[PDB]
Ligand binder design. Sequence first.
Ligand SMILES: Nc1ncnc2c1ncn2[C@@H]1O[C@H](COP(=O)(O)OP(=O)(O)OP(=O)(O)O)[C@@H](O)[C@H]1O
Ligand SMILES: Nc1ncnc2c1ncn2[C@@H]1O[C@H](COP(=O)(O)O)[C@@H](O)[C@H]1O
Ligand SMILES: [Mg+2]
Length: 214
Amino acid sequence: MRIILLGAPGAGKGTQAQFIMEKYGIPQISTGDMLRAAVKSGSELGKQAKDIMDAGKLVTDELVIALVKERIAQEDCRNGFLLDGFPRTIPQADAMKEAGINVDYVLEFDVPDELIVDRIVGRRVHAPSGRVYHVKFNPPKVEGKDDVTGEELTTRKDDQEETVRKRLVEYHQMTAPLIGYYSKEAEAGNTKYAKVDGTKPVAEVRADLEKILG
Ligand SMILES: Nc1ncnc2c1ncn2[C@@H]1O[C@H](COP(=O)(O)OP(=O)(O)OP(=O)(O)O)[C@@H](O)[C@H]1O
Ligand SMILES: Nc1ncnc2c1ncn2[C@@H]1O[C@H](COP(=O)(O)O)[C@@H](O)[C@H]1O
Ligand SMILES: [Mg+2]
């Protein structure tokens, strides 16, 4: 199974990708997690992307496309994969299309801009792994600790109010047009398209997705 998750920053994509990975056994391919992993490892990619990300802007299409193409050529993606935060622009979607890469499902996460800024305030992450929590809506079992390692949680650098509002403007400008892009592909029968109400609690969005994916 091949799946694309669409939605504004903070709409709940990474949270729901982990259930899909658990249930259907396909790797979560999150370009944000890979880029942050590149920073964590000190790679040349990490050196090129760090300042762009901190500014809340999008990394060059050509770089992220090469990143994804190498990632999905790996053996754990042979039987499917979930794309989380990619494609992010029309050129990234056309690059995948011209490469012959079709996906089975496109899932849009619908969340108003107003909830997102308040939501991202309480976002806490196990920075090594990228596991994501919320202090109110999806807390860890132990306040301030990762459920798996017991390591202290942190707050992403780009999750401050000002950066989050920069990211939302980039989303509506560059990314929101992918809604019509993959709706057109679905009408041509090249994928299934579905939209979920991301304002609901995590358990209800999860249930909604299970009905769609089976
Ligand atoms: N259905 C929900 N209701 C309320 N809060 C949620 C819901 N789903 C996820 N969250 C929380 O909102 C925050 C954003 O979640 P998540 O990281 O999954 O969004 P995202 O789409 O991956 O954002 P980004 O694109 O910035 O990575 C997290 O702190 C998460 O715990
Ligand atoms: N597909 C992508 N294309 C360009 N930049 C990306 C992409 N995915 C992630 N990024 C960068 O990584 C940041 C964090 O991604 P995310 O965690 O998905 O919100 C984004 O704000 C961009 O700077
Ligand atoms: Mg995410």
